[PDB]
Amino acid sequence: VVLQRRDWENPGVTQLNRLAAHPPFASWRNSEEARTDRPSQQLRSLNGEWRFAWFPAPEAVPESWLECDLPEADTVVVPSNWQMHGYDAPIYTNVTYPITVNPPFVPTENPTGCYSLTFNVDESWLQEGQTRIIFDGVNSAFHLWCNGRWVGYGQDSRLPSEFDLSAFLRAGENRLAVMVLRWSDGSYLEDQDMWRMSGIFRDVSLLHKPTTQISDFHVATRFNDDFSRAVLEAEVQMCGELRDYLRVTVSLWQGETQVASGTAPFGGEIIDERGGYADRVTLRLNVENPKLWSAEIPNLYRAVVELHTADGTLIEAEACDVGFREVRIENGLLLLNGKPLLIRGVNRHEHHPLHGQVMDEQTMVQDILLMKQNNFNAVRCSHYPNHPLWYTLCDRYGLYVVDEANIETHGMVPMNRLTDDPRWLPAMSERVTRMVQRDRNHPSVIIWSLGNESGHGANHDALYRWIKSVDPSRPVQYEGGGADTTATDIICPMYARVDEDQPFPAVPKWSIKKWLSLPGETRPLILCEYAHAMGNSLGGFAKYWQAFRQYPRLQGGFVWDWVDQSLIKYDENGNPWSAYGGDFGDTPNDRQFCMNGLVFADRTPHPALTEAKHQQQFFQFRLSGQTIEVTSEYLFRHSDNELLHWMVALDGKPLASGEVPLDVAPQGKQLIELPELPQPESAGQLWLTVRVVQPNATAWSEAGHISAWQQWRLAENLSVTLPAASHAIPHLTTSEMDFCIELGNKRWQFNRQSGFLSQMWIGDKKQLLTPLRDQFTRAPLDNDIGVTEATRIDPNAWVERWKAAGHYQAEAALLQCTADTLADAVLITTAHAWQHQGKTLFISRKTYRIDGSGQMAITVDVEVASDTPHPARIGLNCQLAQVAERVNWLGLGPQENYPDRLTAACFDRWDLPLSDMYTPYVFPSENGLRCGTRELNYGPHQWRGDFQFNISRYSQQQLMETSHRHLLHAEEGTWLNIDGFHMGIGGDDSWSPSVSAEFQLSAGRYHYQLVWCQK
Amino acid sequence: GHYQAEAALLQCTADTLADAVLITTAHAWQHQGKTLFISRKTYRIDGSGQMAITVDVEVASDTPHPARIGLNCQLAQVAERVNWLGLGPQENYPDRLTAACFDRWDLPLSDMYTPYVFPSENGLRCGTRELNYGPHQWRGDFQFNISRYSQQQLMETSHRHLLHAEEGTWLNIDGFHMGIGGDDSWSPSVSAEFQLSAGRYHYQLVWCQK
Ligand SMILES: O=C1O[C@H](CO)[C@H](O)[C@H](O)[C@H]1O
Ligand SMILES: [Mg+2]
Ligand SMILES: [Mg+2]
Ligand code: NA
Ligand code: NA
Ligand code: NA
Ligand code: NA
Ligand code: NA
């Protein structure tokens, strides 16, 4: 029957014998346990070692497995993904389905995981009531047997499937057998851009309920105009025999204080001509001055739902955390508790580099803490309902949640092929309805989403209306079909740019500012995905935040995304390394496109995270004279855990500092008058840095946590005093092949054939391993590459434009190399042309002026052909012989920063170990640049000017040729890149050019100057 | 003190090269002990009669962004025509140059002055790579105006009819010039991207005989 009916190739069958969905249950038999959320004796975990065997197809599974353990089986941890145990390969594909597109059919070779468990059941559980099993997540479909007898079937990898085992169990030992299919008709609705895995990857549990039971409950909170009064309404449903003596009590608790209670027998109000629900009752509780829930202050109450008899005997209790909040859209604005939200959001997949798609409490907490510490207040469940614990943590720590149905059909042509087809409405409906049934009581969930990237079909319209009808308390959004369809309350585009239109046919991505005011349009706009954080990215992040702050109806967005989907593999030395698409023999695959996170898989931050934190600050600052104006962007809380530290420094040297308590009302302002600052002794630039510090620890932060900062230039005193003239004069030695300059034990050598500084000596010690030469290219970032591939060139990608123009192949031709002796210096003058196939790309004209103090002043003037693609950089590079421990600079830092991602960086004196000047992006690229640098120190060297630089043990060539960070090898000495100018990194998306015009090197003529001397 | 600032000499040296003489200068402009601008130049005069002028200017970050960064002189020559390769033919400024076209333009000198009834800076042409006037040629990438009226006279005269042609010709050649604005005329209206706020500025000119 099971193999005959092939339920996994039939979208008409999404389950067999599966129980109705409902909010989290524990069946407490003690009301105080329910109140305190203590573990329930009626809810048992089957998260232990199970038996597991892999088969290539369900037809290969022997019948004997139903009755007894396979001796070839292994003992494995559950929950798990079986790919993470090495039984078969995980597959990384983005859009293209991992199976032939032939709905509803799947491959005949369909990896089948056979799970079994021998376990004990207490006799008390079988003497009365109902024993069910709950599988929180099985990917992607499964049949269940208990003691050899078939129980049921379930689909949807991301919601719990529950089955009644009451009739199947015996006291003492029982055996479960679970046949999990990798592919099913369910796979057509699970085409998310992520690793394709399978197995029993979320909790398995047993729940005991009495025969007469709470079968469902819904909690609603409604408010008066100023939120000083609320009514809690709790609808409770029962299963079992109705009796007149049955009662429901709902009580509400604020900590240990019961603030409200109501009791009633079953029997709802009249609904229609046939009466009402005899098996339901609704309790209404009045609450005066409720403490309101928000991300800012996650005030929670406890609601306890008791099923009991009239004489006071408890049958069972259920419970939930209640957050008093109202979500509504009014006059085009998303309001929470009557105030307009600014969504500092991020998309977050459930990913662990070791455990795959199994989520654990410690990782969830780690994520939430890091999110809140970096000024996020919102999370989108891209693109499926999450592990149930996630919502509990968001309720308690305070994050706004978009809960999203497990529906993505991206690889269909056209995208809405299934979603517009009524045959697929049943399968889709369950993915929406069962999510709402599970999660509707969580205050953290503020918005429902219909799924992701499935075009716009009539099924979306049907299900949009279903949610609006069943749960008016939350807006419904959905991006498919152009982000502004009839199936969305919120304009929710993905990667729509701030100012630039992308007028794609049928589904344009308008400038977000333009989108708001299109004729007839009135809705709020919140990007479901923006600022694609793939590799060296988040260029232009500040442009979004400026627009969000200026435009009331631009209420923010969700960054794509939180964490790199890299997986751990092991090399010959047993060393773990970070792997992406194709590294498991998976083909076709989309390579590094699974790594788009603000953090690495182990939760180490990428440099981009600090840019996000800074731009998402909750305090805004202005300076006028001596006065700092602090504005609060909080809607609800006062700044009751904040002080402002200020510091004034002269080119990194502290001059004065102080602290002032912050006492700002939500949306309020505070004026802070700085004391008279003593005029600086020396020439240079005064910089003011302020930071907001939280003195006290919180649930989400340590004492001393810095939440916000800003810098301003104050007075500058330009240096007019001429340095004391040196009593030494450098000497020029002219040969046919070289111009040499000597000064004491120091020597500089200019090769007359090449026109470059080929060597420098301090004594007999060589300083260079490679000559100092111009550089106009960078090892391409993920943003420079886009979707280009050797077998499928995208001619529009920056890297392909540079390659085709010959930028990477360009050869320096010497035009001029002269030497002159001045009164106090030797002057070398050079000119080079870079050419490719008869075309002059760049001309570089330099002077080198070496004086008696041993300083070498370098002037560089570059011409760039107007018709060549704008170059990635205009700078110099060389391989230094020195390997030193520290890097010390006066400039923007301390973290990696680029021209379109430097707002977070501060100007000061920074000193880091050399290894911190390299950013270990899993896919290697140009990295570690620091901008706006006036002084750089490394070993015996000092460079002064106004430049950008990176410094590391890796050449641009190696970074360019190496596809994985673990394969990199430190080269001899230290590669230094000093740029007069560097192109933006972009990132609005990572599949098309995204570097804004103002960060492109398009000026045609460029000037910069450096001084190279001894520290 | 921008209008009051006096040039203070910091450095003036001369060097003989293989095929050239190199004059190096540095000046500071100060007002009441405050240094507003520093200008560092080299003048390279070669055997072909060309004088290459390299200018590097520092602007104190806390002084209001200056109206222009350039050079001026009063030429002895009064010539009939002005010939330039750059944006024209009409007056154009950095935030008002979209209508102008890059080409070879040739106008009478009088057309290089715009007779605004209330006199001011006027007649600039931007994006100019070559300027010709009598025996003189200037090459680079600059903005310029050229007329018989000094900036001082234009500043001091309230009506165009009271202007008098001065001896010779006043040339203003700018590496950089501030936007003119105009969103309104009663509050600052020059957009940030047209303010001279970069702190350090570089430009180069070659002066020769045509
Ligand atoms: O449009 C999208 O962009 C992302 C690219 O990394 C990712 O595929 C998301 O799941 C998808 O919604
Ligand atoms: Mg099916
Ligand atoms: Mg997709
Ligand atoms: Na806004
Ligand atoms: Na991706
Ligand atoms: Na405070
Ligand atoms: Na690479
Ligand atoms: Na005037």
Side-chain angles (χ1 to χ4, degrees):
Chain A
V1 181
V2 161
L3 281 167
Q4 273 182 286
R5 278 239 184 154
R6 307 186 73 78
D7 296 301
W8 66 93
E9 297 186 301
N10 181 8
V13 176
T14 55
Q15 58 82 27
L16 291 170
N17 296 322
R18 183 162 73 186
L19 302 173
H22 54 82
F25 284 170
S27 190
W28 286 282
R29 312 303 169 81
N30 178 285
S31 300
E32 187 66 14
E33 300 299 289
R35 188 190 65 83
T36 55
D37 202 44
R38 249 110 66 171
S40 172
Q41 290 170 53
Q42 291 62 239
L43 179 57
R44 282 183 52 195
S45 175
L46 300 176
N47 290 6
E49 290 161 296
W50 285 50
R51 298 283 288 165
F52 178 85
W54 187 94
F55 294 90
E59 292 91 348
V61 178
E63 195 183 25
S64 74
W65 171 72
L66 302 186
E67 290 293 348
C68 96
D69 185 60
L70 290 163
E72 330 94 75
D74 299 317
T75 300
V76 306
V77 169
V78 166
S80 51
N81 288 111
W82 75 62
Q83 291 78 24
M84 300 300 91
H85 294 162
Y87 288 99
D88 66 18
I91 297 157
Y92 173 58
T93 178
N94 169 13
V95 177
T96 310
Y97 278 101
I99 62 172
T100 309
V101 185
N102 185 32
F105 307 103
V106 300
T108 58
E109 288 186 55
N110 188 3
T112 303
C114 283
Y115 294 80
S116 65
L117 175 69
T118 302
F119 67 107
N120 284 278
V121 185
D122 299 17
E123 59 181 32
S124 64
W125 281 46
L126 303 173
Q127 289 172 351
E128 59 199 312
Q130 171 201 52
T131 301
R132 75 180 65 188
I133 185 159
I134 300 168
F135 292 87
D136 276 326
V138 186
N139 186 348
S140 70
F142 73 102
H143 278 286
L144 172 71
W145 294 260
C146 185
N147 296 322
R149 295 170 56 199
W150 181 80
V151 175
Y153 178 81
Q155 292 181 193
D156 188 348
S157 303
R158 299 283 170 163
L159 287 175
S161 281
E162 306 182 19
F163 305 93
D164 196 343
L165 296 184
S166 302
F168 294 87
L169 294 163
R170 67 178 78 92
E173 292 193 354
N174 298 260
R175 187 167 169 270
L176 300 161
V178 187
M179 185 184 82
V180 180
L181 301 154
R182 183 169 191 173
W183 312 119
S184 67
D185 57 80
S187 302
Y188 287 97
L189 304 184
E190 298 180 358
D191 197 42
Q192 290 88 352
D193 176 18
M194 65 183 193
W195 289 98
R196 314 308 172 103
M197 300 196 187
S198 49
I200 303 177
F201 73 103
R202 291 185 186 162
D203 300 339
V204 189
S205 60
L206 295 174
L207 178 68
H208 191 271
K209 296 273 275 171
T211 309
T212 302
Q213 56 180 237
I214 302 160
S215 53
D216 198 5
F217 68 95
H218 312 154
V219 181
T221 59
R222 296 189 315 270
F223 306 85
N224 65 348
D225 50 13
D226 68 348
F227 299 87
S228 65
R229 304 180 73 188
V231 172
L232 190 146
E233 186 166 288
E235 181 184 299
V236 185
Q237 313 183 0
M238 69 78 75
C239 282
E241 184 177 13
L242 289 164
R243 307 288 268 99
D244 293 344
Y245 60 70
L246 294 179
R247 300 285 182 276
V248 174
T249 294
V250 173
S251 61
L252 186 77
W253 300 77
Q254 204 281 89
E256 269 60 60
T257 305
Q258 181 175 295
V259 296
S261 187
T263 301
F266 283 95
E269 66 179 323
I270 291 159
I271 285 213
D272 54 50
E273 292 88 341
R274 295 285 283 166
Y277 287 91
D279 53 340
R280 301 180 185 178
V281 66
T282 298
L283 291 298
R284 287 175 189 89
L285 309 187
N286 296 319
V287 181
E288 305 304 298
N289 307 116
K291 306 192 90 184
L292 307 177
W293 184 95
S294 64
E296 307 180 11
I297 315 181
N299 295 308
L300 293 173
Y301 288 70
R302 188 78 174 167
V304 179
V305 183
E306 294 169 300
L307 175 63
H308 61 96
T309 62
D311 79 307
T313 301
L314 184 66
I315 297 164
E316 70 160 349
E318 301 291 1
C320 70
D321 297 332
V322 178
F324 281 79
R325 93 277 177 276
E326 182 197 78
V327 190
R328 75 178 203 268
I329 296 168
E330 187 163 287
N331 208 33
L333 296 171
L334 179 67
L335 311 178
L336 190 108
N337 300 337
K339 303 292 183 191
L341 290 176
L342 180 47
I343 296 300
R344 297 153 165 90
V346 66
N347 289 273
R348 179 190 174 268
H349 267 285
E350 290 183 320
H351 179 87
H352 192 287
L354 189 61
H355 305 308
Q357 295 172 355
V358 180
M359 275 309 323
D360 63 280
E361 182 166 351
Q362 288 174 71
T363 302
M364 288 183 178
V365 169
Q366 177 185 36
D367 281 341
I368 294 162
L369 299 189
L370 282 169
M371 285 161 70
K372 291 186 74 69
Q373 287 162 19
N374 285 279
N375 293 330
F376 291 89
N377 65 7
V379 64
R380 173 166 174 241
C381 295
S382 62
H383 303 286
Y384 41 71
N386 276 209
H387 186 297
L389 188 60
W390 182 247
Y391 308 88
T392 306
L393 301 169
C394 290
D395 291 345
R396 296 177 184 178
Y397 282 101
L399 289 177
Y400 305 125
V401 178
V402 177
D403 202 8
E404 183 156 281
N406 183 24
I407 306 162
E408 170 156 3
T409 72
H410 204 157
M412 297 303 304
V413 179
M415 210 185 308
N416 82 347
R417 188 169 287 272
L418 305 182
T419 60
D420 203 42
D421 182 352
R423 178 178 148 162
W424 287 83
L425 177 60
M428 282 176 72
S429 77
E430 290 189 7
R431 285 156 188 270
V432 168
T433 64
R434 295 172 77 245
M435 169 186 69
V436 170
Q437 286 174 315
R438 191 189 72 164
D439 294 346
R440 61 183 297 170
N441 293 333
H442 281 292
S444 65
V445 177
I446 60 157
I447 292 159
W448 300 113
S449 172
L450 301 177
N452 192 61
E453 299 180 321
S454 307
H456 174 223
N459 300 355
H460 287 117
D461 300 314
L463 295 175
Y464 166 84
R465 184 58 207 160
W466 185 89
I467 304 177
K468 298 288 281 183
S469 176
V470 305
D471 181 28
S473 76
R474 295 172 176 97
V476 178
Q477 78 170 45
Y478 176 64
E479 181 278 340
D484 64 358
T485 70
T486 55
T488 193
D489 294 336
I490 297 163
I491 308 159
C492 55
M494 48 174 62
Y495 319 101
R497 295 176 182 193
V498 172
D499 300 305
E500 181 191 353
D501 288 348
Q502 299 169 84
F504 307 120
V507 283
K509 297 188 196 299
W510 306 114
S511 152
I512 64 180
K513 297 179 190 174
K514 165 175 175 168
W515 212 320
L516 288 179
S517 58
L518 291 181
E521 190 55 72
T522 55
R523 286 167 288 182
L525 189 159
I526 305 169
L527 293 125
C528 72
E529 303 174 26
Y530 81 114
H532 197 258
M534 183 179 185
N536 196 348
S537 197
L538 250 77
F541 195 67
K543 193 177 290 180
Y544 279 97
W545 285 89
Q546 191 280 327
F548 298 160
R549 291 188 170 99
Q550 184 172 16
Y551 285 61
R553 283 170 53 215
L554 293 183
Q555 294 186 260
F558 298 84
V559 173
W560 189 276
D561 65 354
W562 181 244
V563 55
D564 281 346
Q565 287 185 61
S566 61
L567 290 170
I568 292 157
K569 290 178 63 75
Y570 303 90
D571 69 17
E572 289 187 42
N573 292 345
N575 204 45
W577 54 274
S578 292
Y580 52 78
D583 289 336
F584 297 88
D586 46 313
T587 188
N589 69 80
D590 286 290
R591 47 185 177 86
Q592 72 264 38
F593 204 65
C594 57
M595 302 184 301
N596 317 139
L598 294 170
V599 304
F600 291 100
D602 73 356
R603 271 62 177 183
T604 310
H606 294 199
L609 186 58
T610 191
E611 190 79 355
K613 176 177 187 180
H614 179 53
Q615 286 302 319
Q616 296 167 357
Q617 284 168 182
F618 290 91
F619 297 96
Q620 300 300 297
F621 306 94
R622 297 213 314 268
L623 179 74
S624 182
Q626 292 282 118
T627 311
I628 299 160
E629 184 196 69
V630 184
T631 303
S632 174
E633 284 189 327
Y634 284 111
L635 307 176
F636 313 114
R637 64 174 296 269
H638 280 251
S639 68
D640 65 358
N641 188 21
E642 277 92 359
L643 60 80
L644 189 91
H645 278 129
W646 61 267
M647 157 76 75
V648 177
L650 183 70
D651 297 331
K653 297 165 281 177
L655 256 280
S657 63
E659 51 184 288
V660 182
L662 280 177
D663 182 26
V664 208
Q667 305 286 282
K669 294 170 178 178
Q670 180 184 339
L671 298 176
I672 293 163
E673 193 81 7
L674 293 164
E676 193 206 316
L677 300 153
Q679 256 68 290
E681 312 287 325
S682 170
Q685 175 75 69
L686 290 173
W687 283 86
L688 168 67
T689 304
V690 306
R691 58 185 72 171
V692 176
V693 177
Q694 308 181 167
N696 304 128
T698 67
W700 58 271
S701 57
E702 303 169 317
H705 174 77
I706 297 154
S707 64
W709 66 93
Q710 189 54 252
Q711 280 196 313
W712 297 264
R713 284 180 176 84
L714 306 181
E716 183 174 36
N717 295 304
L718 294 174
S719 187
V720 295
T721 55
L722 293 88
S726 185
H727 287 78
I729 166 83
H731 180 258
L732 171 67
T733 303
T734 296
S735 64
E736 200 200 5
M737 305 288 263
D738 296 288
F739 289 131
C740 290
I741 298 92
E742 305 89 29
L743 185 86
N745 282 336
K746 290 175 184 182
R747 284 158 56 213
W748 296 259
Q749 180 190 307
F750 292 86
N751 186 309
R752 292 181 76 179
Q753 289 187 313
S754 75
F756 298 113
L757 180 67
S758 56
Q759 197 49 271
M760 277 177 291
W761 285 276
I762 298 165
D764 54 286
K765 196 61 70 78
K766 301 183 172 183
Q767 301 295 301
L768 302 178
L769 292 167
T770 304
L772 180 68
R773 295 170 56 100
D774 305 77
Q775 183 176 228
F776 303 102
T777 55
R778 72 186 175 197
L781 319 176
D782 276 314
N783 291 335
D784 298 333
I785 295 160
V787 297
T788 196
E789 223 144 281
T791 51
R792 189 189 170 175
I793 305 291
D794 174 6
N796 197 36
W798 276 106
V799 70
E800 299 291 349
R801 285 188 274 169
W802 295 325
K803 277 169 71 193
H807 287 203
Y808 291 100
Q809 309 290 54
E811 307 197 86
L814 186 60
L815 306 174
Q816 187 195 144
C817 185
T818 63
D820 289 303
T821 314
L822 309 175
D824 61 347
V826 175
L827 183 71
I828 312 301
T829 303
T830 66
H832 292 82
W834 278 262
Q835 300 167 312
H836 177 76
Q837 296 179 2
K839 165 70 176 179
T840 303
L841 304 170
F842 323 109
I843 297 170
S844 176
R845 290 183 181 94
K846 302 190 205 71
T847 70
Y848 301 79
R849 197 183 181 278
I850 301 166
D851 60 42
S853 58
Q855 298 179 61
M856 177 178 55
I858 310 169
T859 307
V860 184
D861 292 279
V862 163
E863 293 189 74
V864 183
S866 71
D867 57 334
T868 205
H870 316 312
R873 47 147 56 90
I874 298 167
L876 304 176
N877 94 317
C878 67
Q879 191 185 6
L880 305 168
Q882 179 84 10
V883 177
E885 288 179 346
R886 310 297 297 182
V887 180
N888 179 286
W889 79 105
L890 184 73
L892 300 173
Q895 300 193 37
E896 176 190 282
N897 60 89
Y898 284 79
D900 53 346
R901 200 197 70 220
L902 54 67
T903 69
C906 287
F907 186 95
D908 217 308
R909 168 77 59 185
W910 307 108
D911 195 300
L912 296 178
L914 172 66
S915 68
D916 277 1
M917 306 303 287
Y918 158 69
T919 304
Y921 293 117
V922 175
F923 179 83
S925 68
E926 153 67 36
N927 75 86
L929 203 78
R930 270 78 171 169
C931 291
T933 297
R934 313 304 299 281
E935 181 187 302
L936 170 66
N937 301 291
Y938 185 70
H941 304 292
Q942 177 175 98
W943 302 265
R944 288 186 283 104
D946 185 18
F947 56 83
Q948 344 306 318
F949 79 95
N950 68 51
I951 189 164
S952 72
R953 309 283 306 278
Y954 315 111
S955 64
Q956 294 289 292
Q957 188 188 341
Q958 191 191 165
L959 292 166
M960 201 179 322
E961 293 171 357
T962 311
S963 61
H964 288 77
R965 69 181 190 180
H966 80 283
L967 298 174
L968 291 166
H969 68 269
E971 299 175 37
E972 193 188 352
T974 308
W975 281 100
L976 172 72
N977 300 296
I978 293 182
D979 297 329
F981 308 88
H982 201 100
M983 175 178 150
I985 65 181
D988 281 357
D989 63 69
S990 305
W991 44 96
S992 70
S994 65
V995 182
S996 202
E998 72 278 15
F999 297 106
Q1000 297 179 30
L1001 305 188
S1002 60
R1005 285 156 300 281
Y1006 286 93
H1007 174 86
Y1008 65 101
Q1009 50 196 69
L1010 308 163
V1011 174
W1012 193 328
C1013 62
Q1014 203 163 55
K1015 203 196 187 299
Chain B
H2 285 204
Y3 294 101
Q4 308 271 98
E6 293 165 47
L9 186 59
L10 303 174
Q11 188 202 348
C12 186
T13 58
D15 288 287
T16 304
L17 306 179
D19 66 331
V21 178
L22 181 69
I23 309 299
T24 304
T25 66
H27 291 82
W29 279 263
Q30 294 162 316
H31 189 257
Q32 295 171 16
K34 162 76 178 170
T35 301
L36 308 168
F37 325 108
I38 296 173
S39 173
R40 296 186 176 87
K41 305 184 201 70
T42 59
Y43 301 78
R44 199 181 176 272
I45 303 166
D46 59 39
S48 65
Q50 299 181 52
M51 174 175 61
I53 309 168
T54 307
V55 188
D56 290 284
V57 171
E58 289 189 67
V59 181
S61 70
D62 57 349
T63 203
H65 311 316
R68 46 148 52 90
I69 294 171
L71 306 173
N72 81 324
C73 64
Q74 189 179 15
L75 304 167
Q77 176 88 28
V78 178
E80 284 176 350
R81 312 294 296 184
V82 176
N83 180 287
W84 79 104
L85 180 71
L87 299 175
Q90 294 189 52
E91 172 193 280
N92 59 90
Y93 284 80
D95 56 347
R96 198 197 74 222
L97 53 64
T98 71
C101 290
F102 185 91
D103 215 310
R104 173 76 57 172
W105 307 106
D106 193 301
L107 295 176
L109 179 65
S110 64
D111 281 356
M112 306 305 287
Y113 154 76
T114 303
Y116 293 118
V117 178
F118 178 84
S120 73
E121 158 66 41
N122 74 84
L124 201 81
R125 270 77 168 169
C126 296
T128 300
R129 312 303 301 277
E130 182 188 297
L131 175 59
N132 298 295
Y133 188 67
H136 303 293
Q137 176 175 104
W138 301 266
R139 286 183 274 98
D141 185 16
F142 57 84
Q143 347 305 323
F144 79 94
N145 70 56
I146 188 167
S147 78
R148 308 287 306 275
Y149 318 108
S150 65
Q151 294 290 297
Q152 188 180 352
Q153 195 193 160
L154 294 164
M155 202 177 310
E156 289 170 355
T157 315
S158 60
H159 294 74
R160 69 179 188 180
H161 79 285
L162 301 170
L163 287 170
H164 68 274
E166 294 174 48
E167 203 193 332
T169 312
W170 279 99
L171 174 72
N172 302 292
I173 287 186
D174 297 328
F176 307 87
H177 198 106
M178 177 177 145
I180 62 178
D183 283 356
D184 61 68
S185 302
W186 48 92
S187 66
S189 61
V190 184
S191 198
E193 71 274 18
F194 295 109
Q195 296 178 34
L196 302 187
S197 63
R200 282 154 307 280
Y201 284 90
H202 174 92
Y203 65 101
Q204 43 200 72
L205 299 158
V206 180
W207 194 332
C208 69
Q209 184 178 32
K210 195 185 188 291

